[PDB]
Design a protein around this nucleic acid. Structure first.
Lengths: 84, 53, 176, 1111
DNA sequence: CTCCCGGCAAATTGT
DNA sequence: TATAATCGAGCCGGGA
RNA sequence: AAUU
């Protein structure tokens, strides 16, 4: 619907504004894990193979990426209203 | 309904009707005035009738 | 302004042993004329408990200090053998006609807000008759007839009316 | 208070039972309470005898029985069940070869039962079967429009029970017969019946030029067999004319009492017109191996004699109510039963071929599915089975007495001209001339007259009193239209002394034509004026003073009156308002004499003479079809001695047993500051204060939880992402608690649905991930309050799968229903009407101090503009007010019957007595005439209203006798410069309420193929801006406004999305794109193999699909 | 002539 | 998969 | 089937 088209579009734009504020390496891992790239939510082992690191290393940058993401959110209050 | 007091260029329009008909315009104005944080939040406020201030 | 009847969730209910449905009962409570003797008292709460084959009138309300029921003969509910009526009616002081949707006053969860006709004045007419000071003619003799429910007095009404009008004429003082 | 009744007419008979057209018809069809050997051959009984025996083994019908209903009436409505009885039939199978007899009673399905008040319950909803008017079977003779001196004879059977036949005499001189659009010389058929020229020449020869057109030598040269084969080849080309085949086709067309049915009424009309006797309902017989004629020769004989001008032969008026008959509920239903029966017979023969030809009982041979479906089809989808109108008790009473010319076996709306819609003279006393719909259906749907009853043949009869000599008997004869045309019928108001006619000259009718006649010539006399009009029309006092077009609106609008909590009977009644409540069945009465044992809100227990203690439960706040509250209230007290037929409880819209469709209000007739303009109405806020025109309304909300391929929908209090504020009033299970106040947006029933496969978007996965609330499996589908609705929750019904007594449609776990009630105070935009057709919407509500008021301080209730009267010519409302004024002060109500009513002198006498109370009170209380009453009196005497030189009291009385009073403007205090008409009027609040009609939409649902907004308030629809609306924008030259209608505000998808986004960002709306419905048009033309190309100015193709449709 | 196909006001609601 | 079964069941105007 |  016009509302939905507007809402989803605005959401895609705010999500990207927050991911560019992450290093390229730690933003790409989050996109691969939640399916924003390729549509599939990749396992921890697979993300290890594409960046060539250990399954535990990839879990670590996801939490620090997600934690840093959480910090920028508490600061700018940008993504809160899309939770409905 | 007849509205004798109107000037020829006027009509009576129910407030509840106008809120729906002008809803997109209303959302923007609710943001300029601090009445809502942003457009998405403003719409949620109009959804429940008891939430309308 | 509000009514709570025990074991009644809403206005469209009906009470066993009682002839009147709750809608009619509240319709009867709207005729209750309740005088506050103490001018500082803006709200009260009348209690009523009745059972058995009796016709509840306004007298059966439990007497409260500084409060007089001006029409104790008013019919409220007709109860029959085994009928049990226990209620709490909140009475307020106010002005004009404030409908239930407007005030929405509820002392408790199961309370039914009631349309409030606050005004004590039942009828007002005024006669204008011819009179003379014996030199001059077409003078006016003014007679105001004022009927009331008794909570306030026809005279008290007139003074408040005059006092309102006087206070209103003051508003013409500061021009811009 | 006193009830003063007017009128000098003594009505010898009461109104008939008003629902008898319904009640008696179905009882007659079922005969369930009759023991089988004594059932007459009619209705269900006749249907069985027609279908059986089933030949091919022979299966024969013994008897049927109807069981008791599986569920009572209240229960069916609750559970969405049809109220019906099990039908069983005892059948015996015979093997004609063996002699074997196996007999069993087979179950044929269920038959729907009619309730006490004449309605049905079909899947939980109350329905009415509307009687159907149609052409009576029989033999008719009409003039041929093409050739003036010639005529056509038509033999017409019951609908779908045979073909229509036409006997035309062609210009060449031979008598032609037309059947199934094919014509031939009728002579051929005469020879097949076994007629020989000797019989035919001698019989019709008397008519000189005609008998020779019948003579054809070649036809006589062939025996009835050659003539039968010859005819069959004419009617059915390509079918080999096998001798057994022709008998079979022709027999089925004429002699088969199974494939061709004239009415029983058809037989009588035929026997009566041609002066013969029919052995049956067929035009001919198969007897002694050959065909033996019945109808054709008498019909041919009459046709020749009429063309010749033989005395005693007339043309038939096809709109005469003797030749037009009513098909009542029983007959209509039985027809569908017969069809369902014939399909079951087709099933029997096919089962008498397949499987074991030996080992078969009736139970294996009969499949009742065809029968259950035919009846279920009639009740669910027929055009004569209508949703009951039960807005108020009168709504349903009127519905049952309606007569439709439409439906399966009658006209279409595009197929009926003036003749049928006209008021025929024979409608007098039978069908009401006033009560018909305004608009497209005018004259097709009508209403049964009050004293009319439908006889066994289906003709409407109306009562008349015998007059022998000059004495008016008390014996009433119900007459058909045909029989009425014989006598001279005097009017009901003709003066009487005792039983003797007291006038030397009376007003009477001969064939409807008015004529003046001496008492010696009076054969009968009308029973009453009431007998000419419907029940609704009869509720309008002073009807004799109202123009019919307005009385029509008066009738119909009483149907729409909403039951009021304070509802009152009119102060001026017609005397029918008691009977309507009683026959309606809303009110509750005492069976025998007795004593009241108990009185409750929920019940009344009565002790009778019998000693037996009978308990009558009361229907309290039940929701009718239209959402008005049907609620019964107890009118007696414990220990009251009641007689047989005494009132026990008031139904809806009844007051102490009298029909209460509205309130009696004090009305002033005068313009008021333009709030009165063009029929608008001004009301006093005092009406709301005392709760006049307040009505209770209940709306029903429903929700299903069903099994899905994604998992079960669940009704739960657990709804993703919802606050405790939002869930506050929901119980443990997720259902709103009884009594809560619900407003738009509020949750009624909580429900979860499993998120589809394209589950949360990766965008949504990451957003939720940020907040550390991992994404849920289910979504919130809860049922919510629609915009503009809401109220107090009075009921919840929950039906699951696996609880005793309930099984839902496949896949549905549970169904929850929420009943929400509202007390509606009268408001601006609500519609009011009186019984004379004055209708208007409430435009202004004044505080009591602005209302015009009487000198003694009493303010008026309603101000109606006088500009509504003169053009409308409905003056009954004016007389109603005058008598209503008298009654306001005397404290009385009146019964003024239609056409025998209160007359002016009598109203004036009552008004004088009122003035004494209105004025003498004041003079004794120590008040004299007012200064302003003098000023108005001055101006009134300039108007010729008062006589100059009389005392003010005398003049005020002169004005009061004209129904006018001095009126003070509550704003000024100054009088109205002239005396104004004031009195008590009966006014109803109709079912059209702004709350229901107000609607607005920004954006919302769109349609699948067109992508245009859906329609209607219930779908949150957009308004249709149709062709004519586009013309308006075009004529204004508003091109950009119009383009918006065609694109951004409709089916331009890209445009509307972009336009919305711009408005919420504060930008101006963008220029539109291609409407999606044009793309639909293009592709639909491609599907037709037509190439549609949008081209630029260079004639190069433009792709409006933007590459999406090209490889 | 006869027949065969095309037309036959708008918006709204309701089960 | 093998007795034998063999042909169905609304009025109106205008244009070829 | 209603409303205008």
């Amino acid at each position: 619907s016009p509302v939905d088209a507007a809402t989803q579009s605005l959401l895609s734009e705010e999500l990207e504004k927050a991911l560019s504020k992450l290093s390229e390496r730690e933003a790409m891992v989050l996109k691969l894990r939640k399916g924003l790239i390729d549509g599939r939510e990749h396992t921890l082992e697979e993300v290890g193979a594409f960046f060539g690191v250990t399954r535990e290393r990839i879990r670590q940058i996801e939490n620090k990426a997600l934690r840093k993401l959480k910090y920028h959110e508490s600061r700018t209050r940008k993504l809160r209203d899309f939770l409905d | 309904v007849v509205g004798p007091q109107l000037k020829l260029h006027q009509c009576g329009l129910p407030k509840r009707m106008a809120l729906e008909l002008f809803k997109p315009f209303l959302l923007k104005k609710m943001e300029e005035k601090g009445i809502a944080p942003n457009v998405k939040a403003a719409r949620r406020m109009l959804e429940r009738q008891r939430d309308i201030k | 302004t509000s009514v709570y009847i025990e074991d009644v969730l809403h206005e469209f209910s009906t009470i066993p042993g009682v002839k009147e449905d709750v809608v009619e009962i509240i319709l009867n409570l709207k005729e209750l004329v309740v005088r506050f003797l103490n001018p500082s008292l803006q709200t009260v709460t009348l209690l009523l408990k009745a059972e058995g084959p009796k016709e509840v009138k306004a007298r059966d309300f439990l007497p409260v200090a500084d409060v007089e029921i001006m029409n104790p003969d008013l019919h409220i509910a007709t109860l029959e053998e085994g009928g049990r009526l226990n209620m709490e009616v909140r009475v307020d002081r106010g002005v004009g006609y404030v409908p239930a949707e407007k005030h929405g006053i509820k002392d408790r969860i199961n309370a039914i807000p009631v349309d409030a006709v606050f005004s004590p004045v039942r009828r007002v007419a005024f006669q204008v008759e011819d009179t003379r000071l014996g030199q001059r003619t077409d003078l006016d003799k003014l007679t105001l007839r004022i009927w009331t429910d008794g909570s306030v007095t026809p005279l008290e009404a007139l003074n408040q009316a005059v006092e309102i009008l006087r206070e209103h004429l003051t508003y013409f003082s500061n021009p811009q | 208070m006193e009830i003063k009744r007017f009128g000098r007419i003594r009505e010898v008979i009461p109104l008939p039972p008003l629902t008898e057209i319904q009640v008696e018809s179905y009882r007659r069809a079922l005969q369930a309470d009759v023991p089988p050997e004594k059932r007459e051959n009619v209705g269900i009984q006749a249907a069985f005898r027609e279908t059986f025996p089933i030949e091919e083994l022979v299966l024969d019908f013994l008897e049927y029985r109807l069981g008791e209903p599986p569920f009572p009436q209240d229960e069916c409505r609750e559970k969405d069940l049809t109220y019906q009885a099990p039908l069983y039939a005892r059948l015996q199978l015979i093997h004609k070869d063996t002699g074997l007899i196996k007999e069993d009673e087979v179950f044929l399905g269920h038959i729907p039962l009619m309730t006490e008040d004449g309605s049905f319950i079909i899947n939980g909803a109350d329905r009415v079967i509307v009687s159907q008017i149609h052409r009576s079977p029989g033999v008719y003779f009409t003039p041929d429009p093409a050739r003036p001196g010639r005529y056509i004879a038509s033999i017409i059977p019951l609908p779908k029970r045979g073909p229509w036949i036409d006997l035309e005499v062609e210009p060449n001189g031979v008598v032609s017969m037309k059947v199934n659009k094919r014509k031939f010389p009728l002579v051929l058929l005469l020879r097949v019946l076994g007629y020989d020229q000797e019989t035919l020449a001698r019989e019709l020869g008397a008519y000189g030029e005609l008998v020779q057109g019948l003579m054809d030598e070649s036809v006589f040269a062939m025996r009835p067999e050659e003539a039968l084969i010859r005819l069959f080849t004419l009617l059915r080309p390509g079918d080999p004319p096998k001798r057994d085949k022709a008998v079979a086709y022709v027999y089925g067309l004429i002699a088969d009492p199974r494939r061709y049915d004239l009415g029983e009424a058809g037989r009588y009309k035929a026997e009566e017109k041609l002066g013969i006797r029919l052995s049956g309902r067929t035009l001919a017989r198969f007897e002694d191996g050959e065909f033996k004629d019945e109808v054709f020769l008498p019909t041919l004989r009459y046709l020749f004699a009429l063309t010749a001008g033989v005395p005693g032969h007339e043309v038939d008026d096809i709109d005469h109510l003797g030749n037009r008959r009513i098909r009542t509920v029983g007959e209509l239903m039985t027809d569908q039963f017969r069809v369902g029966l014939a399909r079951l017979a087709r099933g029997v023969r096919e089962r008498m071929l397949m499987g074991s030809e030996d080992s078969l009982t009736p139970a294996k041979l009969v499949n009742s599915r065809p029968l259950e479906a035919a009846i279920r089809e009639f009740f669910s989808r027929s055009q004569l089975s209508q949703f009951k109108d039960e807005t108020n008790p009168l709504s349903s009473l009127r519905h049952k007495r309606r007569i439709s010319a439409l439906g399966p076996g009658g006209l279409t709306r595009e197929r009926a001209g003036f003749d049928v819609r006209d008021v025929h003279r024979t409608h007098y006393g039978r069908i009401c001339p006033v009560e018909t719909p305004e608009g497209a259906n005018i004259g097709l749907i009508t209403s049964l007259a009050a004293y009319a009853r439908v006889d066994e043949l289906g003709f409407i009869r109306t009562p008349y009193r015998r007059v022998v000599g000059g004495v008016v008997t008390d014996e009433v004869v119900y007459m058909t239209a045909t029989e009425e045309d014989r006598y001279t019928i005097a009017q009901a108001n003709t003066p009487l002394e005792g039983n003797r006619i007291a006038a030397e000259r009376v007003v009477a009718r001969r064939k409807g034509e008015p004529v003046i006649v001496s008492p010696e010539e009076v054969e009968f006399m009308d029973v009453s004026p009431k007998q000419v009009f419907s029940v609704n029309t009869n509720l309008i006092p002073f009807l004799e003073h109202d123009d019919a077009n307005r009385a029509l609106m008066g009738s119909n609008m009483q149907t729409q009156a909403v039951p009021l909590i304070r509802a009152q009977a009119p102060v001026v009644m017609t005397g029918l308002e008691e009977r309507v409540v009683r026959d309606s069945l809303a009110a509750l009465y005492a069976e025998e004499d007795g004593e009241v044992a108990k009185v409750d809100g929920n019940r009344i227990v009565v002790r009778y003479e019998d000693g037996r203690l009978v308990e009558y439960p009361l229907r309290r706040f039940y929701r009718s079809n239209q959402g008005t509250a049907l609620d019964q209230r107890p009118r007696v007290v414990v220990g009251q001695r009641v007689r047989k037929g005494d009132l026990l409880a008031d139904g809806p819209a009844s007051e102490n047993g009298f029909l209460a469709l509205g309130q009696n209000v004090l009305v002033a007739i005068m313009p008021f500051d333009g709030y009165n303009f063009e029929d608008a109405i001004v009301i006093s806020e005092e009406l709301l204060k005392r709760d006049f025109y307040t009505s209770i309304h209940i709306e029903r909300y429903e929700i299903e939880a069903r099994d899905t391929k994604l998992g079960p929908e669940r009704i739960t209090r657990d709804i993703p992402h919802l606050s405790e504020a939002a869930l506050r009033d929901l119980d443990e299970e997720g259902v709103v608690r009884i009594g809560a106040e619900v407003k738009p947006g509020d949750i009624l029933v909580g429900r979860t649905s499993f998120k589809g496969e394209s589950e949360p978007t990766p965008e949504e996965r990451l957003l939720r991930s940020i907040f550390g609330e991992k994404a849920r499996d289910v979504k919130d589908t809860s049922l919510r309050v629609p915009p503009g609705e809401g109220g107090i929750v009075v009921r919840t019904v929950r039906l699951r799968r696996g609880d005793p007594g309930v099984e839902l449609k496949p896949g549905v776990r549970e169904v929850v229903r929420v009943y929400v009630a509202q007390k509606r105070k009268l408001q601006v935009g609500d519609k009011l009407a009186n019984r004379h057709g004055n209708k208007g919407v409430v435009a202004k509500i004044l505080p009591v101090e602005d209302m015009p008021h009487l000198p003694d301080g009493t303010p008026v209730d309603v101000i109606l503009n006088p500009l509504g009267v003169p053009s409308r010519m409905n003056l009954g409302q004016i007389l109603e007010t005058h008598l209503g004024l008298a009654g306001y002060f005397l404290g009385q109500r009146y019964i003024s019957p239609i056409f025998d009513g209160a007359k002016e002198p009598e109203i004036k006498e009552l008004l004088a007595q009122a003035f004494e109370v209105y004025f003498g009170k004041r003079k004794g209380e120590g008040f004299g005439v007012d200064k302003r009453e003098v000023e108005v009196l001055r101006r009134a005497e300039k108007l010729g209203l008062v006589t100059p030189g009389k005392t003010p009291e005398e003049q005020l009385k002169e004005l009061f006798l004209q129904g006018k009073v001095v009126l003070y403007d509550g704003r000024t205090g100054e009088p109205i410069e002239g005396p104004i008409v004031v009195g008590q009027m009966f006014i109803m609040k109709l079912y059209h309420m702004v709350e229901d009609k107000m609607h607005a939409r920004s954006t919302g649902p769109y349609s699948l193929i067109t992508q245009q907004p859906l329609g209607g308030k219930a779908q949150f629809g957009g308004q249709r801006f149709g062709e004519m609306e586009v013309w308006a924008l075009e004529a204004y030259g508003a091109a950009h406004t119009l383009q918006e209608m065609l694109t951004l505000k409709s089916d331009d998808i890209e445009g509307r999305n972009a336009a919305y986004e711009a408005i919420i960002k504060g930008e101006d709306v963008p220029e539109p794109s291609v409407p999606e419905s044009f793309r639909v048009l293009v592709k639909e033309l491609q599907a037709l193999a037509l190439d549609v190309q949008t081209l630029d100015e260079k004639d190069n193709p433009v792709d409006i699909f933007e590459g999406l449709a090209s490889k």
